[PDB]
Design a protein around this nucleic acid. Structure first.
Length: 174
RNA sequence: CCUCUGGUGUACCGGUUGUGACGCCAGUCGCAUCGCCGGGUAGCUAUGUUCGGAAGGGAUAACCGCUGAAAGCAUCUAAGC
């Protein structure tokens, strides 16, 4: 698989330690861990790493591709990290970051308080935008989805919480 | 469950008709659906009183996902959450 054949690059300050199944990546941003499928083997030569199958099975190639992708994600995350940029649209819709808990007012009869998990930080330049930053792409996406699920966009006006890079289908009555 | 509101309450109290008896008056008792009629203690009881189906964990159904290759893109799935 082309993804597996492609080699991943270690920038410099990040270290990759394989200990049997449980590979670990250390970096400036923090610590991450990744397990390896029984068909996959990893060879680190120079900063570069090679994912290749132990057996020539199609399943082994597929697992090698997914392993290369996840490790590339982990290395990029520890080196630099990611952010999400959620946006809020609607009249009276508001948000604020206080400590580790984000407070939202989305038109219900009670404010919503959402507790950020360990590893993700948030900040709001204004009331209608949220910036989530983290080293873990998967956890960052999960947190963004959970925050968006409190009030999803509607087609008639677009009110609600949306991704910055999100296309929203729109219609009208009659 | 029986404090309250009621029902029943033929061994509790009273009014009264006919007849027989207790020697007689007075006073009582038997029989007449408990003779008929008015009340009513405990117990039982509903139509009376009080209480219950509150809240919370765990795994899931349809459904909605996150990251992610096979298939350089895409994709809730094949690893994983």
């Amino acid at each position: 698989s082309r993804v597996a054949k492609a080699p991943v690059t270690v920038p410099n300050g990040v270290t990759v330690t394989q200990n049997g199944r449980q590979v670990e990546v250390k970096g400036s941003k923090g610590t991450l861990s990744f397990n390896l499928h029984a068909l996959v083997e990893l060879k680190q030569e120079e900063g570069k790493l090679q994912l290749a199958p132990a057996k020539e099975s199609k399943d082994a190639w597929m697992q090698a591709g997914t392993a290369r992708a996840v490790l590339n994600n982990l290395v990029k995350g520890v080196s630099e990290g990611f952010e999400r940029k959620l946006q809020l649209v609607g009249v009276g819709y508001k948000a604020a970051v206080k400590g580790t808990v984000v407070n939202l007012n989305l038109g219900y009869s009670h404010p919503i308080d959402y507790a950020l998990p360990e590893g993700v930080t948030a900040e709001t330049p204004t009331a209608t935008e949220i910036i989530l930053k983290s080293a873990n792409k998967q956890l960052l996406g999960q947190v963004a989805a959970e925050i968006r699920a409190y009030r999803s966009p509607e087609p008639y006006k677009g009110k609600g919480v949306r991704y910055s890079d999100e296309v929203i289908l729109r219609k009208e009555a009659k």
